[PDB]
Amino acid sequence: SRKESYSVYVYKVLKQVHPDTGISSKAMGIMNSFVNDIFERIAGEASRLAHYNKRSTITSREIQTAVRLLLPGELAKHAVSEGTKAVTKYTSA
Amino acid sequence: RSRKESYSVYVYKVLKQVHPDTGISSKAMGIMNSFVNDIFERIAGEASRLAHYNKRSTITSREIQTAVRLLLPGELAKHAVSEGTKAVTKYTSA
Amino acid sequence: LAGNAARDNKKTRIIPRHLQLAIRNDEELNKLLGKVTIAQGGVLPNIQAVLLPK
Amino acid sequence: KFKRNPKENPLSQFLEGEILSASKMLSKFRKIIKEEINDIKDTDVIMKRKRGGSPAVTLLISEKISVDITLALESKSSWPASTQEGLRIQNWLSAKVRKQLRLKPFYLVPKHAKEGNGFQEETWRLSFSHIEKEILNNHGKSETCCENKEEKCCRKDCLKLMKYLLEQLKERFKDKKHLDK
Amino acid sequence: KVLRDNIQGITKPAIRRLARRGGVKRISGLIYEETRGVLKVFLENVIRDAVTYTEHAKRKTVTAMDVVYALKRQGRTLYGFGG
Amino acid sequence: LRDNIQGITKPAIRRLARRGGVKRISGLIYEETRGVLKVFLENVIRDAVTYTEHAKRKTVTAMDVVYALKRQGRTLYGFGG
Amino acid sequence: PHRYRPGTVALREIRRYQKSTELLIRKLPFQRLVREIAQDFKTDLRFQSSAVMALQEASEAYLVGLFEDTNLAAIHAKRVTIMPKDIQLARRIRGE
Amino acid sequence: PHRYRPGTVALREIRRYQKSTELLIRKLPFQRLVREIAQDFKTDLRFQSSAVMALQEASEAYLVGLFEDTNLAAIHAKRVTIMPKDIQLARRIRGE
DNA sequence: ATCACAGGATGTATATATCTGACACGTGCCTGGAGACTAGGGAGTAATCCCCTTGGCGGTTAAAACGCGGGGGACAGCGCGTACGTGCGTTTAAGCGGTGCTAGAGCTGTCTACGACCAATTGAGCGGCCTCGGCACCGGGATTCTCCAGGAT
DNA sequence: ATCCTGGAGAATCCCGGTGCCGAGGCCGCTCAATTGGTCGTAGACAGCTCTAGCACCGCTTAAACGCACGTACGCGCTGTCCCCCGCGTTTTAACCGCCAAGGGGATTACTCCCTAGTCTCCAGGCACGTGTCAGATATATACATCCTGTGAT
Ligand SMILES: [Zn+2]
């Protein structure tokens, strides 16, 4: 009898952008649906890219390419910039 | 040499049952190959989801069956179900 | 269905066109593959009545 | 029987379970014609009571003319496998004529399955009358044989004489009933 | 017990209100019927898939997720009722 | 290799329109049509490039075009698949 | 006497319904419609209240989007009144 | 000085183009269009001839479907001639 | 002044003969399918707990249904004029075929850094709990809309 | 018939207080993340082959380009008419809160058995090769559809 969600992380992010803003349980539920939708897609595409190129491993590159295929304009771009860094840093961390 | 797979041989055979006296162009065959791979992926893809949704590691004749019902419209979906249901019933009986 | 199209055109085989005609004439296949573009499929010969004279 | 067909099939009214009823179609076919012939005003047309199913309707025009009307279903599918070895013209009119003809439709006529001491009511019999006509008028492997006196053969003549022989004998002995069938 | 004619449960004001939200200013009398005949198809497609999913899972009661999958299958996603 | 949109001849545009059942074409259609065709091509080509790049290639293959088209609700049959 | 003219209120209502977030279709009626449809495919068919609401919002969202396109078709046709054929065109273009 | 009236030929062309399957857009022109677009993403890029054809067929298929909807919009508007706006409406309804 | 017909003009479908290259069929591999075997984790089954759906009751209230009058938009009909279609003659570059170059796809073989896997430890996150604060609702007043009358255009 | 204030009459915004129940923070605890070590193989890399994509040339010729004529179409304007809208009064059933019953979803414990993974062996299927027939091309003939004149009505 236990579930998991991103409610706690979404809450925190709101503060990074709007330190004084709260959030309803529904808005949170909506954000949870959003996160899971985007997650599935990127993971789906990353799988496929590995598949198309006849590979077994998903790397940061497949994630990057998947991001571009799904996201339009700058959102795709800022996401790539951020993803690149997190990996670059995590390694050196 | 590297080697490629297709359904060209199976498509010919099916053609013979519907039209024993006819042939097929290489393009029409290429199209039928594109077709089979498309349908396969969809059914397998939906079957994948059903297995995931219902908390399974295995695809069975049911996940295939349900995927068919969701993907195919009206009666066409039905004949596919009838034939599949049978083929399994039969396979283990053959 | 494509074979029937081939026969309609007095042929002994299926070409990409016959596949297109077959798929589209059959409502349920028309839909199953309703987003599919067939190489050299052409289109159905549907002409709007309002464009025709008396 | 009819295959999957999404849209409404207007011949549904003649179905009996899955099967297209020859009995219903023939019965209704003659019923329609009967009502309609009574609307023929300049010509006197009388309908005969039906006995078999090969002629659906026999019409009697004044005192001289009779007309046998056969109803046939048309199918444009490849011919059934049972016809695969039929139309045995390969050594006569050629395999290529045979192939051409088989790209054409075949027909089904309402016909009870006549058998040893009875019959089936809703059966249909295969019909190739259109091919027979094509053959009679294309009886040569030259295919234009007889349309020119240089290539005049007696196939057509022999058949007429054979038909005439049987018809004459049937008329001769129509009373002894030996030849009615 | 069996139900019936709840298509009329979608009342005239309800249709107008939807039309108005959509920017429709003026509505022909025949729209009501025409609209219902379209709404109905939409509902049929979504409900059916939800049922199909429900049956696959061998359940009797349709849950929000069954509806969500059904709507996703038709390509119209819905947030806040699961995901 | 510039404004090659003009390489799409007027008759070429009209013929497509005809195939679509169009009987009469406004004189302003040619340009409007181009503004749409171009966007379509831009979206498809770019995805194909993205796939090509991912794969570390320089030549765009039919398969890269197919993936680009596919995802837009457009499976194309005939070039493999 | 005093009243607003035809169209004054309609514009007002457009504003208002665009503005508000609630359901425009009555709930029990909608719920029943769902069941009436459901009872075609099978019996023993039950719904959670959350499933019905999920269906209702999706259903309204569908019709509203359809009406937006319908309205445009009516405008395209140089009209204010929407007619069944404006709905039909919009749907056809969509590919329904 | 025999002539065929306006619309007689137009219908004829419609018949034919619906019937046939061949590409209507000239190839070298189309190929170059692809490249001009491509060079805006990347220089020194190459294409297989089959890739160009794949693009061309999809491109024509797109435009033809667009024209069919455009034609319907013009008809809805009581007109035979299609105008830029009829294209725009169809696209919009489609979500573009 | 309109109907239909006949003739011409044009374009289509038709049979005919010949050409060629794309299919249909046969050969020889060779590697993926099928049979045979063990091992163990997932799926099936039943217990049973209790949460949530169903059904029913009675008030109470807003929301629907109905009817009436009247303005306003939909529609049909008319006429203007211009923006397209059709056909002719001239210009263009598309398509075909062939040539020649080499850039980059595609495959091979080697080696090693990376991730699956497993066992141990623990603290980040989920469920249940209380607290009270932002939001929804009530009632009153301010002022910001729409619409008509009467006096200008 | 149309523009310009100025008033009357609703409708919508803003103000301040009630009160409630949904968010937000705290505590226990438990099981999913983290660490640390081992194994083996997927992927990185270099090397080499040779397919096929690019660039260029000249010739043939069917398409594209531009122009002139003229008329079917789009567009705007007018008037009818009728059918929606807006309001008020009557009628309905949706909604709310409360209650009880029990059906079926969710979790537990246990056990096979149905699959994955392994090795062995052979025939089904793919790459290549070759021959000839179907469809494409082109010629020429005959039938069908379209559009002005032309008499009949
Ligand atoms: Zn002869």
PDB file of N, CA and C in Angstrom, chain D residues 27-69:
ATOM      1  N   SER D  27     -37.723 -16.684 -55.871  1.00  0.00           N
ATOM      2  CA  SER D  27     -39.125 -16.443 -55.600  1.00  0.00           C
ATOM      3  C   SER D  27     -39.497 -14.993 -55.793  1.00  0.00           C
ATOM      4  N   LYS D  28     -38.646 -14.121 -55.283  1.00  0.00           N
ATOM      5  CA  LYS D  28     -38.880 -12.705 -55.381  1.00  0.00           C
ATOM      6  C   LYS D  28     -38.625 -12.175 -56.777  1.00  0.00           C
ATOM      7  N   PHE D  29     -37.604 -12.706 -57.429  1.00  0.00           N
ATOM      8  CA  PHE D  29     -37.299 -12.333 -58.797  1.00  0.00           C
ATOM      9  C   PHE D  29     -38.493 -12.538 -59.710  1.00  0.00           C
ATOM     10  N   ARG D  30     -39.114 -13.715 -59.643  1.00  0.00           N
ATOM     11  CA  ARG D  30     -40.269 -13.945 -60.493  1.00  0.00           C
ATOM     12  C   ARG D  30     -41.458 -13.127 -60.020  1.00  0.00           C
ATOM     13  N   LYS D  31     -41.566 -12.890 -58.707  1.00  0.00           N
ATOM     14  CA  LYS D  31     -42.675 -12.067 -58.154  1.00  0.00           C
ATOM     15  C   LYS D  31     -42.586 -10.647 -58.722  1.00  0.00           C
ATOM     16  N   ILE D  32     -41.376 -10.081 -58.817  1.00  0.00           N
ATOM     17  CA  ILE D  32     -41.182  -8.732 -59.321  1.00  0.00           C
ATOM     18  C   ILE D  32     -41.544  -8.663 -60.782  1.00  0.00           C
ATOM     19  N   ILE D  33     -41.063  -9.639 -61.536  1.00  0.00           N
ATOM     20  CA  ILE D  33     -41.305  -9.674 -62.960  1.00  0.00           C
ATOM     21  C   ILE D  33     -42.783  -9.860 -63.230  1.00  0.00           C
ATOM     22  N   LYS D  34     -43.428 -10.742 -62.486  1.00  0.00           N
ATOM     23  CA  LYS D  34     -44.858 -10.948 -62.643  1.00  0.00           C
ATOM     24  C   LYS D  34     -45.637  -9.645 -62.519  1.00  0.00           C
ATOM     25  N   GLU D  35     -45.338  -8.872 -61.482  1.00  0.00           N
ATOM     26  CA  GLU D  35     -46.085  -7.648 -61.254  1.00  0.00           C
ATOM     27  C   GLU D  35     -45.824  -6.659 -62.364  1.00  0.00           C
ATOM     28  N   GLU D  36     -44.589  -6.655 -62.830  1.00  0.00           N
ATOM     29  CA  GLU D  36     -44.154  -5.750 -63.871  1.00  0.00           C
ATOM     30  C   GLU D  36     -44.678  -6.113 -65.260  1.00  0.00           C
ATOM     31  N   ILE D  37     -44.752  -7.404 -65.583  1.00  0.00           N
ATOM     32  CA  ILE D  37     -45.266  -7.782 -66.899  1.00  0.00           C
ATOM     33  C   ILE D  37     -46.724  -7.389 -67.045  1.00  0.00           C
ATOM     34  N   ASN D  38     -47.451  -7.323 -65.937  1.00  0.00           N
ATOM     35  CA  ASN D  38     -48.836  -6.885 -66.012  1.00  0.00           C
ATOM     36  C   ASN D  38     -48.925  -5.400 -66.396  1.00  0.00           C
ATOM     37  N   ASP D  39     -47.779  -4.715 -66.371  1.00  0.00           N
ATOM     38  CA  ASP D  39     -47.652  -3.333 -66.818  1.00  0.00           C
ATOM     39  C   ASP D  39     -47.144  -3.221 -68.258  1.00  0.00           C
ATOM     40  N   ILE D  40     -46.994  -4.358 -68.933  1.00  0.00           N
ATOM     41  CA  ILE D  40     -46.717  -4.364 -70.364  1.00  0.00           C
ATOM     42  C   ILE D  40     -48.040  -4.357 -71.087  1.00  0.00           C
ATOM     43  N   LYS D  41     -48.300  -3.264 -71.778  1.00  0.00           N
ATOM     44  CA  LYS D  41     -49.633  -3.007 -72.274  1.00  0.00           C
ATOM     45  C   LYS D  41     -49.795  -3.315 -73.757  1.00  0.00           C
ATOM     46  N   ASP D  42     -48.736  -3.123 -74.536  1.00  0.00           N
ATOM     47  CA  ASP D  42     -48.839  -3.337 -75.975  1.00  0.00           C
ATOM     48  C   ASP D  42     -48.600  -4.797 -76.340  1.00  0.00           C
ATOM     49  N   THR D  43     -47.798  -5.476 -75.536  1.00  0.00           N
ATOM     50  CA  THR D  43     -47.491  -6.882 -75.753  1.00  0.00           C
ATOM     51  C   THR D  43     -48.159  -7.708 -74.668  1.00  0.00           C
ATOM     52  N   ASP D  44     -48.758  -8.836 -75.031  1.00  0.00           N
ATOM     53  CA  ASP D  44     -49.325  -9.680 -73.990  1.00  0.00           C
ATOM     54  C   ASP D  44     -48.230 -10.597 -73.484  1.00  0.00           C
ATOM     55  N   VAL D  45     -47.893 -10.441 -72.210  1.00  0.00           N
ATOM     56  CA  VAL D  45     -46.913 -11.297 -71.566  1.00  0.00           C
ATOM     57  C   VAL D  45     -47.446 -12.083 -70.376  1.00  0.00           C
ATOM     58  N   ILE D  46     -47.368 -13.401 -70.455  1.00  0.00           N
ATOM     59  CA  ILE D  46     -47.931 -14.262 -69.427  1.00  0.00           C
ATOM     60  C   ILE D  46     -46.764 -14.953 -68.731  1.00  0.00           C
ATOM     61  N   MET D  47     -46.807 -15.052 -67.410  1.00  0.00           N
ATOM     62  CA  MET D  47     -45.797 -15.846 -66.721  1.00  0.00           C
ATOM     63  C   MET D  47     -46.184 -17.304 -66.513  1.00  0.00           C
ATOM     64  N   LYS D  48     -45.204 -18.184 -66.691  1.00  0.00           N
ATOM     65  CA  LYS D  48     -45.338 -19.607 -66.397  1.00  0.00           C
ATOM     66  C   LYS D  48     -45.062 -19.878 -64.916  1.00  0.00           C
ATOM     67  N   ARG D  49     -45.695 -20.910 -64.362  1.00  0.00           N
ATOM     68  CA  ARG D  49     -45.349 -21.369 -63.019  1.00  0.00           C
ATOM     69  C   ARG D  49     -43.960 -22.006 -63.048  1.00  0.00           C
ATOM     70  N   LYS D  50     -43.101 -21.598 -62.118  1.00  0.00           N
ATOM     71  CA  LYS D  50     -41.733 -22.100 -62.073  1.00  0.00           C
ATOM     72  C   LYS D  50     -41.672 -23.538 -61.589  1.00  0.00           C
ATOM     73  N   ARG D  51     -40.752 -24.302 -62.168  1.00  0.00           N
ATOM     74  CA  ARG D  51     -40.516 -25.675 -61.755  1.00  0.00           C
ATOM     75  C   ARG D  51     -39.083 -25.856 -61.268  1.00  0.00           C
ATOM     76  N   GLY D  52     -38.115 -25.550 -62.126  1.00  0.00           N
ATOM     77  CA  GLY D  52     -36.718 -25.646 -61.729  1.00  0.00           C
ATOM     78  C   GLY D  52     -36.171 -24.273 -61.365  1.00  0.00           C
ATOM     79  N   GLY D  53     -34.842 -24.181 -61.241  1.00  0.00           N
ATOM     80  CA  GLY D  53     -34.214 -22.911 -60.828  1.00  0.00           C
ATOM     81  C   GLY D  53     -33.223 -22.391 -61.854  1.00  0.00           C
ATOM     82  N   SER D  54     -32.815 -23.228 -62.815  1.00  0.00           N
ATOM     83  CA  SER D  54     -31.918 -22.737 -63.897  1.00  0.00           C
ATOM     84  C   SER D  54     -32.615 -21.627 -64.691  1.00  0.00           C
ATOM     85  N   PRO D  55     -33.886 -21.742 -65.158  1.00  0.00           N
ATOM     86  CA  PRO D  55     -34.595 -20.601 -65.745  1.00  0.00           C
ATOM     87  C   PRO D  55     -35.427 -20.096 -64.561  1.00  0.00           C
ATOM     88  N   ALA D  56     -35.223 -18.846 -64.124  1.00  0.00           N
ATOM     89  CA  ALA D  56     -35.914 -18.351 -62.948  1.00  0.00           C
ATOM     90  C   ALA D  56     -37.349 -18.110 -63.355  1.00  0.00           C
ATOM     91  N   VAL D  57     -37.478 -17.552 -64.551  1.00  0.00           N
ATOM     92  CA  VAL D  57     -38.745 -17.138 -65.108  1.00  0.00           C
ATOM     93  C   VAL D  57     -38.872 -17.573 -66.554  1.00  0.00           C
ATOM     94  N   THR D  58     -40.036 -18.079 -66.915  1.00  0.00           N
ATOM     95  CA  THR D  58     -40.365 -18.263 -68.320  1.00  0.00           C
ATOM     96  C   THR D  58     -41.511 -17.343 -68.676  1.00  0.00           C
ATOM     97  N   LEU D  59     -41.290 -16.504 -69.669  1.00  0.00           N
ATOM     98  CA  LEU D  59     -42.344 -15.624 -70.127  1.00  0.00           C
ATOM     99  C   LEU D  59     -42.895 -16.105 -71.444  1.00  0.00           C
ATOM    100  N   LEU D  60     -44.200 -15.997 -71.553  1.00  0.00           N
ATOM    101  CA  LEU D  60     -44.935 -16.351 -72.742  1.00  0.00           C
ATOM    102  C   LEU D  60     -45.499 -15.124 -73.429  1.00  0.00           C
ATOM    103  N   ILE D  61     -44.963 -14.846 -74.598  1.00  0.00           N
ATOM    104  CA  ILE D  61     -45.322 -13.686 -75.385  1.00  0.00           C
ATOM    105  C   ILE D  61     -46.241 -14.060 -76.532  1.00  0.00           C
ATOM    106  N   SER D  62     -47.438 -13.486 -76.511  1.00  0.00           N
ATOM    107  CA  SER D  62     -48.495 -13.907 -77.415  1.00  0.00           C
ATOM    108  C   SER D  62     -48.544 -15.420 -77.578  1.00  0.00           C
ATOM    109  N   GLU D  63     -48.627 -15.911 -78.798  1.00  0.00           N
ATOM    110  CA  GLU D  63     -48.763 -17.355 -78.968  1.00  0.00           C
ATOM    111  C   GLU D  63     -47.565 -17.959 -79.682  1.00  0.00           C
ATOM    112  N   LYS D  64     -46.472 -17.215 -79.779  1.00  0.00           N
ATOM    113  CA  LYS D  64     -45.338 -17.728 -80.538  1.00  0.00           C
ATOM    114  C   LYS D  64     -44.011 -17.706 -79.812  1.00  0.00           C
ATOM    115  N   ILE D  65     -43.831 -16.754 -78.910  1.00  0.00           N
ATOM    116  CA  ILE D  65     -42.506 -16.533 -78.368  1.00  0.00           C
ATOM    117  C   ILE D  65     -42.426 -16.922 -76.901  1.00  0.00           C
ATOM    118  N   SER D  66     -41.380 -17.653 -76.547  1.00  0.00           N
ATOM    119  CA  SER D  66     -41.096 -17.915 -75.143  1.00  0.00           C
ATOM    120  C   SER D  66     -39.731 -17.376 -74.767  1.00  0.00           C
ATOM    121  N   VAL D  67     -39.625 -16.863 -73.548  1.00  0.00           N
ATOM    122  CA  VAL D  67     -38.360 -16.334 -73.064  1.00  0.00           C
ATOM    123  C   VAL D  67     -37.995 -16.892 -71.700  1.00  0.00           C
ATOM    124  N   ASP D  68     -36.883 -17.607 -71.661  1.00  0.00           N
ATOM    125  CA  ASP D  68     -36.301 -18.113 -70.428  1.00  0.00           C
ATOM    126  C   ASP D  68     -35.327 -17.111 -69.833  1.00  0.00           C
ATOM    127  N   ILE D  69     -35.583 -16.721 -68.595  1.00  0.00           N
ATOM    128  CA  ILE D  69     -34.764 -15.732 -67.920  1.00  0.00           C
ATOM    129  C   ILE D  69     -34.007 -16.386 -66.782  1.00  0.00           C
TER     130      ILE D  69
END
